[PDB]
Write an enzyme that holds these catalytic residues in place. Structure first.
Site, mmCIF file in Angstrom:
data_model
loop_
_atom_site.group_PDB
_atom_site.id
_atom_site.type_symbol
_atom_site.label_atom_id
_atom_site.label_comp_id
_atom_site.label_asym_id
_atom_site.label_seq_id
_atom_site.Cartn_x
_atom_site.Cartn_y
_atom_site.Cartn_z
ATOM 1 N N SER A 195 0.873 -1.178 0.000
ATOM 2 C CA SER A 195 0.000 0.000 0.000
ATOM 3 C C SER A 195 0.903 1.218 0.000
ATOM 4 O O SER A 195 1.884 1.253 0.748
ATOM 5 C CB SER A 195 -0.896 -0.003 1.242
ATOM 6 N N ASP B 160 6.480 -8.230 -12.920
ATOM 7 C CA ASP B 160 5.192 -7.553 -12.804
ATOM 8 C C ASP B 160 5.119 -6.304 -13.690
ATOM 9 O O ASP B 160 4.557 -5.293 -13.281
ATOM 10 C CB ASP B 160 4.953 -7.232 -11.307
HETATM 11 C C1 LIG Z 1 -0.544 4.761 -9.001
HETATM 12 C C2 LIG Z 1 -0.518 4.995 -7.532
HETATM 13 N N1 LIG Z 1 0.811 4.939 -6.887
HETATM 14 C C3 LIG Z 1 1.469 3.833 -6.353
HETATM 15 C C4 LIG Z 1 0.886 2.485 -6.147
HETATM 16 O O1 LIG Z 1 -0.161 2.440 -5.514
HETATM 17 N N2 LIG Z 1 1.516 1.330 -6.505
HETATM 18 C C5 LIG Z 1 0.953 0.111 -5.836
HETATM 19 C C6 LIG Z 1 1.874 -0.942 -5.322
HETATM 20 C C7 LIG Z 1 1.126 -0.074 -4.367
HETATM 21 C C8 LIG Z 1 2.662 1.071 -7.426
HETATM 22 C C9 LIG Z 1 3.770 2.047 -7.597
HETATM 23 C C10 LIG Z 1 2.776 1.847 -8.689
HETATM 24 C C11 LIG Z 1 2.737 4.203 -5.978
HETATM 25 C C12 LIG Z 1 2.890 5.583 -6.293
HETATM 26 C C13 LIG Z 1 3.879 6.595 -6.282
HETATM 27 C C14 LIG Z 1 3.566 7.897 -6.676
HETATM 28 N N3 LIG Z 1 4.700 8.693 -6.657
HETATM 29 C C15 LIG Z 1 5.651 7.876 -6.275
HETATM 30 N N4 LIG Z 1 5.233 6.604 -6.024
HETATM 31 C C16 LIG Z 1 6.061 5.498 -5.558
HETATM 32 C C17 LIG Z 1 2.246 8.225 -7.072
HETATM 33 N N5 LIG Z 1 1.875 9.489 -7.335
HETATM 34 C C18 LIG Z 1 0.490 9.861 -7.566
HETATM 35 C C19 LIG Z 1 0.308 11.304 -7.996
HETATM 36 C C20 LIG Z 1 -1.052 11.850 -7.648
HETATM 37 O O2 LIG Z 1 -1.100 12.019 -6.234
HETATM 38 C C21 LIG Z 1 -2.356 12.504 -5.776
HETATM 39 N N6 LIG Z 1 1.315 7.261 -7.171
HETATM 40 C C22 LIG Z 1 1.664 6.018 -6.816
#
Ligand SMILES: CCn1c(C(=O)N(C2CC2)C2CC2)cc2c3c(ncn3C)c(NCCCOC)nc21
Length: 285
Positions: free
Chosen positions: A20, A130
């Site tokens: 998460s 993955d």
């Molecule tokens: C897309 C969402 N997500 C996930 C994420 O759930 N993952 C799941 C395994 C848990 C993996 C990495 C894909 C990880 C990150 C992340 C972000 N920036 C740096 N990281 C490491 C980010 N920015 C989102 C901007 C908008 O913010 C409001 N969204 C993320």
């Protein structure tokens, strides 16, 4: 290092595999001049999950590339992984929102960056296991990064493949045939998944066009349970493949089909994939 007390929660970013991720502001001076960071934690703490997570942290700490999300640190049991915050989120979500703004040459710029990040993994004998657009993050409109290493494994010193069957839902519609049949993961199974990523890009993440939707359509929606895997195995064995996305040029679809070779050894290398993508980008320009 990072102290728990100065990690101010902003929002839940997402959940994936057994992890998460959340958006926090690391504010140690408590004057709101602190940096916004991405924080990864185990949704359910277990020792097996914990040892995996510690190996995951070591894997990311060891990677330094423009197309790999930056490791910032750790925050202590209740172990948390601190990474840089990439403001545009997943490529999966970004492509859907900017469908009409992102063209073929921009998709190929992203494709190129994914290849360079993936070749860098190969150089460390790391197997992503993955590769999917949901795992690729967007720094800005011109740069993407591999954003998660939750399933990443180091190859044995003496072998080119790694065998692993994890409990839980596996992303079977991105899996190479030998991953479905023998649980064999290699650079070549990542290349197979990379073709699925390239397919995802050219479909612009249209719901009806997703790899599960297309495969379930081909297999039959009457198929349920562990039978889905069996039918998929048979489909791939008989060279049943994801169709050419709408508007995809034949040369880009050719890259996809070459990645989807049942013969592990005949799948192109990430270095060759990058050369081919760059050559097509250069011709389009
Ligand atoms: C897309 C969402 N997500 C996930 C994420 O759930 N993952 C799941 C395994 C848990 C993996 C990495 C894909 C990880 C990150 C992340 C972000 N920036 C740096 N990281 C490491 C980010 N920015 C989102 C901007 C908008 O913010 C409001 N969204 C993320």
């Amino acid at each position: 290092q990072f102290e728990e007390r100065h990690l101010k929660f902003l929002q839940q970013l997402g959940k994936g595999n057994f992890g998460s991720v959340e958006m926090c502001r690391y504010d140690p001076l408590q004057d709101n001049t602190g940096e916004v960071v991405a924080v990864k934690k185990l949704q359910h703490s277990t020792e097996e999950h914990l040892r995996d997570f510690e190996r995951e942290i070591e894997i990311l700490k060891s990677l330094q590339h423009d197309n790999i999300v930056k490791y910032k640190g750790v925050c202590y049991r209740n172990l948390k992984l601190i990474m840089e915050y990439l403001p545009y989120g997943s490529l999966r979500d970004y492509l859907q929102k900017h469908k009409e703004r992102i063209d073929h040459i921009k998709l190929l710029q992203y494709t190129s960056q994914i290849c360079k990040g993936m070749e860098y993994l190969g150089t460390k004998r790391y197997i992503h296991r993955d590769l999917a657009t949901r795992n690729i993050l967007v720094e800005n409109e011109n740069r993407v990064k591999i954003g998660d290493f939750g399933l990443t494994k180091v190859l044995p010193q003496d072998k080119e493949y790694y065998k692993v069957k994890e409990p839980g839902e596996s992303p079977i519609f991105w899996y190479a045939p030998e991953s479905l049949t023998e649980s064999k993961f290699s650079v070549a199974s990542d290349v197979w998944s990379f073709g699925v990523v390239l397919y995802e890009l050219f479909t612009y993440i249209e719901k009806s066009k997703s790899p599960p939707a297309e495969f379930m359509r081909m297999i039959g929606n009457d198929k349920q349970g562990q039978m889905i895997v069996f039918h998929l195995i048979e489909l791939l064995k008989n060279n049943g493949r994801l169709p050419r996305p709408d508007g995809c040029p034949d040369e880009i679809y050719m890259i996809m089909t070459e990645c989807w070779n049942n013969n592990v050894n005949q799948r192109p290398s990430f270095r060759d994939l990058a050369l081919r993508v760059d050559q097509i980008r250069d011709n389009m320009a």
